[PDB]
Amino acid sequence: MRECISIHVGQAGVQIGNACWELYCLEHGIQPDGQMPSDKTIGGGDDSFNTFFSETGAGKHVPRAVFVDLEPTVIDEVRTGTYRQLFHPEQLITGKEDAANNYARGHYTIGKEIIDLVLDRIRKLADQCTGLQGFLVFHSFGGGTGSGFTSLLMERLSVDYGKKSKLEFSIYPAPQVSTAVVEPYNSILTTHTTLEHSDCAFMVDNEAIYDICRRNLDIERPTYTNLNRLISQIVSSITASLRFDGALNVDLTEFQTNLVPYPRIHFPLATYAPVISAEEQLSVAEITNACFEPANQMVKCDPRHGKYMACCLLYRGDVVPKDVNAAIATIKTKRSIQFVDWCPTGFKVGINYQPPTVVPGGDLAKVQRAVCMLSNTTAIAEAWARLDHKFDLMYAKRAFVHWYVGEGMEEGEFSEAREDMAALEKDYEEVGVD
Amino acid sequence: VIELNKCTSGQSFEVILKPPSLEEIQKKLEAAEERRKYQEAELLKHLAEKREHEREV
Amino acid sequence: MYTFVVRDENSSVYAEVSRLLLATGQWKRLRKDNPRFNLMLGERNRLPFGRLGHEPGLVQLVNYYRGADKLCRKASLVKLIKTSPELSESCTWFPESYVIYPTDEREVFAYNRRREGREGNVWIAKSSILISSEASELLDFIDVHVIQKYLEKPLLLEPGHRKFDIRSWVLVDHLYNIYLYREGVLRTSSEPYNSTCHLTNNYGRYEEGNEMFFEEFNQYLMDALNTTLENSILLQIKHIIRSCLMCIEPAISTKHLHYQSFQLFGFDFMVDEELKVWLIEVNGAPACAQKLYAELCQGIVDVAISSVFPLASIFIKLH
Amino acid sequence: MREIVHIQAGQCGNQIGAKFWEVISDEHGIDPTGSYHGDSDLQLERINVYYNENKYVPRAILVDLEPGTMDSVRSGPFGQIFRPDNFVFGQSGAGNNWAKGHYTEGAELVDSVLDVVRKESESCDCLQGFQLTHSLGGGTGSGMGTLLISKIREEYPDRIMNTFSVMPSPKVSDTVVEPYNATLSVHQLVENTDETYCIDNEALYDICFRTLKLTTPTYGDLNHLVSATMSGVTTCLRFPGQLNADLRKLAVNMVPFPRLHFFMPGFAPLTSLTVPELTQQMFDSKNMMAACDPRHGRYLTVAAIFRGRMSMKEVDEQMLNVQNKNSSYFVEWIPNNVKTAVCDIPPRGLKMSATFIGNSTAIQELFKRISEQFTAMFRRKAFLHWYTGEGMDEMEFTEAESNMNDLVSEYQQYQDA
Ligand SMILES: */C1=C\C(=O)C/C(C)=C\C=C\C(=O)O[C@H]([C@H](O)NC(=O)/C=C\C=C\C)C/C(C)=C/[C@@H]2COC[C@H](C1)O2
Ligand SMILES: Nc1nc2c(ncn2[C@@H]2O[C@H](COP(=O)(O)OP(=O)(O)OP(=O)(O)O)[C@@H](O)[C@H]2O)c(=O)[nH]1
Ligand SMILES: Nc1ncnc2c1ncn2[C@@H]1O[C@H](COP(=O)(O)OP(=O)(O)CP(=O)(O)O)[C@@H](O)[C@H]1O
Ligand SMILES: Nc1nc2c(ncn2[C@@H]2O[C@H](COP(=O)(O)OP(=O)(O)O)[C@@H](O)[C@H]2O)c(=O)[nH]1
Ligand SMILES: [Ca+2]
Ligand SMILES: [Ca+2]
Ligand SMILES: [Ca+2]
Ligand SMILES: [Cl-]
Ligand SMILES: [Mg+2]
Ligand SMILES: [Mg+2]
Ligand SMILES: [Mg+2]
């Protein structure tokens, strides 16, 4: 057993973290006070769920997590909410004044002053680990904290935990819910500074989640609470292999091995099904087919018009291999699934037999079987092209640049970040198009 | 179908259809802080010039 | 009010659609890089499909199918036919073809089989032109091409012993309905065929602009060959259109997609002297014969655009 | 990013400021004695932004160079809610003269104002910044107000400075020298505010007269509009929500270039009631308060605030409709430049309302009008003796006119781009 530390940065990171830990408690039979009656080893152990939870003598199961935000109102909701007793104050870090949607403010001006405290709190968690595998880092692209503080943190984690893996869950900006015109800037600045430091990053476009909530959950105007419940299901599907017994994706290194053959192209597409409203049960073939439908993806884009480098199917519930194989056969003859020439055309499959857990009085119906597909396709680069074009339109007139320069950033950091992104778009193109 | 592993909690397998520095960070942050300090000193200088004109009027 | 942008200034078809849309009074043309459009009349190359369908509250439509290039380049059509089971290596209505790079089907280019069998052994090399009965001429010339069997027995129009090709215009809407415009055109040679007179791209003598329309070809087929255009030729044309377009549909359909596509294609056919129709080419960005612009362009507006954006049949539907 | 400190200076500044505090006190359930007597938790959640604490006192400093208007304020409806020490006034008046406000009488009082600003700032947990209400056309709000801003920026250079600035018009005018005082003031604002809401008195007048059919508007009727609009544009600072929730975040979303921070506010409804009606009204020039036609320029950025119980779905729809309809008036090189917020609590007397804040290049028209009225006099040096007798030289006027014409050109540049 090797531990994983989760770090939740800024509003989106923290609020998604609170939804994930709540769901993790429900999947593992951990109560709000941290008690877990099914755990028969009091005060410790090396079960699979101990990757995510430590234990106290009194039998409390404590998330291996840190929450950081540059203003206090989000993390105060963690301190007073349902799962408050899970956490101790050292895990919860707040400043007084936020980054005002400005990467430079998060990274340089305020980042400089709180980074050491954050690293101390993470080290207290690291020191209780026998074999820390690494970090899962949750943040927005668009916020000043989620963008600017995260990139600073990622750099300092490479320095202090050089052999450790780092995975991201990153919220890509969407105008129907975004709070800042400058989000493209923030997204590009943080992607440029973080790219060398992250081994695998799962991007979730708020646009896609919003649309799934509207179309499949019949919510007219999704809130963050609705979005975060859905996001946490996908996150849980991805981390299940670390927290339950299994032979697939059982450590963070294997995420890279199995999904990322080229270090810069480390952004797998997640597709999830089924999403059914809590106000008619789908077969293995149906849910697997649904993984090739753009409407179920976490980022809207067209995989038919790129190439796959890897594909992992993560099932939960009543699924047996024979049904998976028959469904793969079917779908191969109906669909445009082209791998690059230097990778095998194939699927890694994991099945966990416990169905998905739903949050009581959530929007999501209980199902008998669900699947998350992680595919590393070049089609996800469509999302980089969208953002880069937005960046270009504003940067050409230097709109809003003075805000960043005024926090002590140099203007050349913009064009350097941008150039890095143009080389990324070109990398995807070379891998992906004949 | 390769690498079939089974336990009580599930199973996993593979289907193949076809083969083929602290100091540099410190420095960057401090250079930015120095640029913030410079722009602030330029501003206080300009404000001081205004105070002088006020006194002259 | 609907909004549209124009990103291809040299499209005669879309210049006319543009003009028609504005005269309804219910469309506004936006600047070409304004993202708030309902309709993109897109550029021919590197149309940024990945920027479509991300505008909250705008149903967005574009006049090209992404992936349709597969059908509409020489080498990639040949590959599509040879590698798709529903079309196949043995497809009866597409002339024997090989992709030749200056993988390469040089060795597979069957030339010797025919030489040895005393059969007509004339081929045509082209890309995206040389006609010869000698392999090394064609291979030399090419040093991405296709070498395709040249049809030595074309149907010849009388008077003047002369070759033609048939251009059919097909519109595929957002629902993947396939509409064949009921007016086609024969592009004629006006030089007698001698085995200039071989490529159909004395000019003007038999018909205005070396364009014979369907009314006159049908009359000709009746008088000289005792049959019709419908029976002798259009059954085959419709079969081929449908077979080609149904084959790529899973690759290009916009049915469950966050943006929608339509496209106008020009199919080019040859007719041999047994009244067998052969596909030669599919054009992704056709123009139209001068007299047929207004009718076709209106039809694009009714069937591809107003279908998705209602205001306040010239086509045969291939089912 | 909690507390704001409010400053109101001179007659106009204190008359509109008094009304602002009246209206927002009613919205937060605060009575004239400072006691909370409301129904909803939304009212108290962000109360600390504007009020110190079971009594709630406005974080507000009242400034004048004469006593009269402040005596009226103290006797006025909510007069007793202000902190007594927060009234800072001299005796001598400023005679509608910027030089008296800025350089002579104002200079003698400004230190005592700063003493009180500091005592209020010092008991802030985390001061966001300052909001000033004033006129540009008189002497105290204009000359002393811009003096105050410069001194506040020297002591709090990393805090946001926001003004509600009433711009003079010949048609609703006290003196002929208003253009001179406004021109001198505008060069100060350009340098030393982060956000300025430009409120044209002629616009307020024409709304009362043409639209509301008040056949003889008083300052009181103009101020009633203004205070309603100020209530609208501060909703995001004062109640729970996501967007523009503090002064800095608002600036970062609204101000693409530092000097172009002059906004046109709007209110709907203004009719002598559906989401489509609000939405169309809030984008109509007749509902806007700077007397500039937005169809004559381009929006850099817009914030739209809806208040009341309404369908958020239909709000998103209407907001999208307006932009996709008149997309020619939004610069294409700031993507997604219109942001919409919705607060559940409606203003007094209305089931729903909307407030508009536009950063439009058309605002240039307001600066050009002032510029022309300045020149008409300044070319004859008319009325200058009032300023030179306080120590100023003609060169300071030449420089202010130049600075204002430079602002006008900078707007023009982005209008064409
Ligand atoms: C101040 C009001 C006061 O002193 C006089 C009274 C009793 C009412 C004034 C109403 C008023 O100004 O209403 C304005 C519009 O004329 N109202 C409408 O357009 C109403 C419905 C339209 C349907 C199509 C709107 C304003 C400016 C109201 C403000 C809100 O803030 C408080 C302030 C009270 O009135
Ligand atoms: N999915 C989701 N997105 C969120 C959430 N909160 C914020 N966002 C998105 O995150 C972006 C804004 O960044 P935030 O995380 O709020 O900002 P921050 O990290 O707190 O940074 P500052 O407030 O500028 O200090 C936008 O694109 C939002 O729509 C959340 O709970 N869930
Ligand atoms: N296999 C074949 N046998 C006989 N003639 C052929 C032929 N392939 C091409 N041709 C002749 O050559 C002409 C031009 O060929 P092709 O269709 O390849 O060029 P092109 O791309 O310019 C047509 P378009 O303008 O329709 O795109 C055809 O119309 C026909 O006259
Ligand atoms: N809207 C409005 N304008 C006012 C009011 N009182 C004065 N004005 C305007 O303010 C300007 C005069 O400045 P004033 O505030 O009276 O002078 P000060 O006391 O020296 O700051 C002119 O443009 C007047 O039209 C008021 O209550 N409301
Ligand atoms: Ca245990
Ligand atoms: Ca590393
Ligand atoms: Ca004195
Ligand atoms: Cl290490
Ligand atoms: Mg935040
Ligand atoms: Mg062609
Ligand atoms: Mg006065």
Please indicate, yes or no, whether residues D94 and D217 belong to a single structural domain of this protein: yes
Ligand positioned closest to the Cα atom of A163? 8
Which among C8, C1, C3 is positioned nearest to C264, based on CA atoms?
C8
Q: Do C37 and C59 contact (CB within 8 A), yes or no?
A: no
- The verdict on A214 touching C (C-beta cutoff 8 Å) is no
* Token duo for residue D50: 């504007």
A295 CA to chain C: closest CA distance, Å?
7
Out of C133, C152, C171, pick the residue that ends a domain: C152
Residue whose CA lies nearest to ligand 4 atom number 7: D12
In this complex, is the C-beta atom of B45 within 8 Å of any C-beta atom belonging to chain D?
A: no
Could you tell me if A199 and A274 lie in one domain? no
Measured from the CA of A206, which atom of ligand 2 is nearest? 1
According to DSSP, the residues that pair with B55 across neighbouring strands are none
Residues C122 and C166 in one domain: no
Gaps after which residues in chain D, C–N over 2.5 Å? 53, 272
Structural domain span for residue C305: 64-95+153-319
Centroid of ligand 7 to alpha carbon of D371 (angstroms):
33
b/e sequence D24-38, b meaning 16+ C-beta within 10 Å: bbbbbbbeeebebee
Residue of A nearest to C247 (CA): A334
Find how far residue C135's CA is from the centre of its chain: 28
d(CA C164, CA C214): 13
A417 touches chain D (CB under 8 A): no
Minimum-distance CB partner of B50 among D99, D150, D391: D150
C48 and C26 housed in the same domain = yes
Q: Are A154 and A137 in contact (CB under 8 A)?
A: yes
- Give chain A's domain count: 3
Identify the experimental approach. X-ray
* Whether residue A367 sits in one domain with residue A338: yes
Same domain? A263 vs A278 = no
User: What is the resolution of the experimental data for this entry, in Å?
Assistant: 2.2
**Domain endpoint, select from D256, D275, D309:** D256
Identify whether residues A264 and A312 lie together within a single domain. no
The pair of structure tokens assigned to B26 is: 């410190």
Domain holding C147: CATH number?
3.30.1490.20
> At A108, which amino acid appears?
Y
User: CA distances (Å), D414 to each of A9, A174, A397, D300, in order?
Assistant: 37, 26, 9, 9
Characterize C34-64 residue by residue with b for buried, 16 or more Cβ atoms within 10 angstroms of its Cβ, and e for exposed.
ebbbbbbbbbeeebebbbbbbbbebebbbbb
- Domain C-terminal end among A379, A398, A425: A379
Do A355 and A230 belong together in one domain?
A: no
A400 and A322 assigned to the same domain: no
Pocket perturbation via mutation, ligand 4, pick of D7, D8, D12 by most ligand atoms within 8 A of CB: D12
CB neighbourhood size of D215 (10 A) = 6
φ, ψ of residue D405 to 5 degrees: the values are -70, -35
Show which of residues 57-86 on chain C sit within 8 Å of chain D, judged by CB atoms. Answer: 57-58
Task: Examine the domain organization and report whether D175 and D81 are in the same domain.
Answer: yes
Residues C124 and C186 in one domain: no
**D335 vs C: CB within 8 A:** yes
Same domain, C259 and C296: yes
Question: How big is chain C, counted in residues?
Answer: 319
| CA-C187 nearest atom, ligand 3 | 29
Residues with CB under 6 A from ligand 4: D 10-12, 15-16, 94, 96, 135, 137-142, 166, 168, 172-174, 178, 201, 204, 219, 222-223
**Contacts with C60 from chain D: Cβ below 8 Å:** none
Ligand 7 center–CA D105 separation, angstroms: 7
We report the CATH number of the domain holding residue C58 as 3.40.50.11480
Contact C28, C3 (CB under 8 A): yes
Query: Which atom of ligand 4 is least distant from the CA of D139?
Result: 20
For chain B, percent helix, then strand, then coil, each to nearest 5?
60, 25, 10
Q: How many domains does chain C contain in total? A: 3
Q: Both D332 and D417 in a single domain?
A: no
Which of the residues of A are catalytic? Answer: 254
CA distance C17 to chain A (A): 28
Regarding whether D404 and D349 lie in a shared domain, the answer is no
Closest Cα in chain A to D339: A179
User: Is there a single domain that holds both residue A249 and residue A204?
Assistant: yes
Rounded CA-CA distance C97/C89 in Å is 9
Q: Which residues form the domain of A363?
A: 269-379
- Tell me: do A258 and A289 sit in the same domain: no
Same domain, D276 and D209: no
Q: Are strands C178-181 and C164-172 parallel, antiparallel or unpaired?
A: antiparallel
Among A227, A246, A268, the domain boundary falls at A268
> Looking at CA atoms only, how far is residue D310 from chain A in angstroms?
12
CATH number reported for the structural domain that contains residue D307 in this entry: 3.30.1330.20
Q: Tell me if A305 and C51 make a contact (CB, 8 A cut-off).
A: no
A165-172 and A200-205 strand pairing: parallel
C90 and C109 both lie in a single domain: no
Residues D275 and D401 in one domain: no
> CATH code at A399?
1.10.287.600
H or E stretch at A9: strand A4-9
Partner B, chain D 315-354, Cβ-Cβ below 8 Å? none
| Closest Cα to atom 5 of ligand 2 | A12
Residues C59, C198, single domain; the answer is no
Q: Which amino acid is at D278?
A: L
Give the domain range for residue D146: 2-256
Give, as one character, the DSSP assignment of residue D157: T
C-alpha neighbours within 13 Å on the C-beta side of residue A142: 24
Residues D279, D243, single domain; the answer is no
Take residue D402 and report the two structure tokens written for it: 């130049």
Q: Does residue D36 sit in the same domain as residue D108?
A: yes
Q: Name which of D87, D89, D246 is nearest D162 in CA terms.
A: D246
D132 to chain C, minimum CA–CA distance in Å? Answer: 37
Do C308 and C161 lie in a common domain? yes
- Closest CA relative to residue D82, chosen from D61, D111, D109: D61
Q: Do A402 and D253 touch (CB under 8 A)?
A: no
Q: Quick check: D397 contacting B, CB < 8 Å?
A: no
Nearest CA to ligand 2 atom 26: A178
Helix residue ranges per DSSP H, A167-299? 183-194, 206-216, 224-243, 252-259, 284-290
**Is the domain of C183 the same as that of C258?**
yes
Q: Do B7 and A352 touch (CB under 8 A)?
A: no
Is the shortest distance between the CB of D309 and ligand 1 below 6 Å? no
Distance CA D59, CA D131 (A): 11
Q: How far is CA B5 from CA A245, A373, A375, in A?
A: 11, 19, 22
**Interface residue of D237, D300, D334, D338 to substitute, partner A, most A CBs within 10 Å:** D334
Please name the helix (run of DSSP H) or strand (run of DSSP E) that holds residue A381, with its range, or none. helix A381-395
Of D19, D23, D221, D224, best ligand 1 pocket probe by most atoms within 8 Å of the beta carbon: D224
Ligand that lies nearest to the alpha carbon of residue A123, given by its number in the listed order:
8
Same domain, D203 and D281: no
Does one domain contain both D213 and D349? no
Residues C104, C110 contacting (CB under 8 angstroms): no
Q: Kindly state if the Cβ of A143 falls inside 6 Å of ligand 2.
A: yes
Quote the minimal CA–CA distance from A181 to chain D in Å: 6
Alpha carbon distance C88, D190 (integer Å): 73
* CA–CA distance, D1 with D245 (Å, rounded to integer): 9
Check whether residue D50 and residue D136 sit in a common domain.
yes
In terms of domains, do A77 and A157 share one? yes
**Residue of chain B whose alpha carbon sits nearest to that of A352:** B10
- Listed residues D231, D256, D281: the one ending a domain: D256
* Residues in contact with C205: Cβ distance below 8 Å, sequence separation at least 6, in sequence order: C160, C190
CB < 8 Å to A389, chain C: 48, 51
Count structural domains, chain D. 3
Q: Check which CATH number belongs to the domain holding C268 and give it.
A: 3.30.470.20
Alpha-carbon distance values, D178 to D172, D183, D223 (Å): 11, 8, 19
Q: Tell me: do A317 and A340 sit in the same domain.
A: yes
Distance CA C1, CA D323 (A): 12
Q: Whose CA is nearest to atom 11 of ligand 1?
A: D270
Q: How crowded is residue D54: how many other Cβ atoms within 10 Å of its Cβ?
A: 6
Assess whether A94 and A205 both reside in one domain.
yes
Q: Which residue is closest to D101 within chain B, CA to CA?
A: B54
Instruction: Please name the residue of chain B whose CA is at the shortest distance from the CA of residue D188.
Output: B50
Q: Of A148, A222, A128, A245, give the one whose Cα is nearest residue A192.
A: A148
Q: Quick one: C47 and C158 in the same domain?
A: no
From residue D53, how far is each of A429, D5, D22, D29, D345 by CA, in Å? 60, 14, 17, 14, 22
Q: What are phi and psi of D131, to 5 degrees?
A: -125, 130
Cα(D112) to ligand 6 centroid in Å equals 57
For residues C198 and C256, state if they share a domain.
yes
Ligand closest to CA A42: 5
Question: What is the domain-level CATH number for residue A50?
Answer: 3.40.50.1440
Does an H or E element contain D336, and which? Answer: none
Rg for chain D, CA atoms, rounded: 20
| Same domain assignment for residues A145 and A227 | yes
Q: Which helix (H) or strand (E) holds A94?
A: strand A92-94
Chain centroid to Cα C39, Å, comes to 23
By Cβ distance, the residue of C51, C252, C257 closest to A389 is C51
Burial of D349 (0-12, 13-18, 19+ CB in 10 A): exposed
d(CA C28, CA C12): 19
Ligand 1: does its nearest atom lie under 6 Å from the Cβ of D256? no
Q: What single string gives the DSSP state of each residue in A394-430?
A: HHTTTTTHHHHHTTT--THHHHHHHHHHHHHHHHHHH
Residue (of D408, D252, D265) closest to D337 by Cα position: D252
Ion ligand 5 residues within 5 Å by Cβ? A 39, 41, 45
Q: Identify whether residues D358 and D372 lie together within a single domain.
A: no
Domain's final residue, options D239, D256, D273: D256
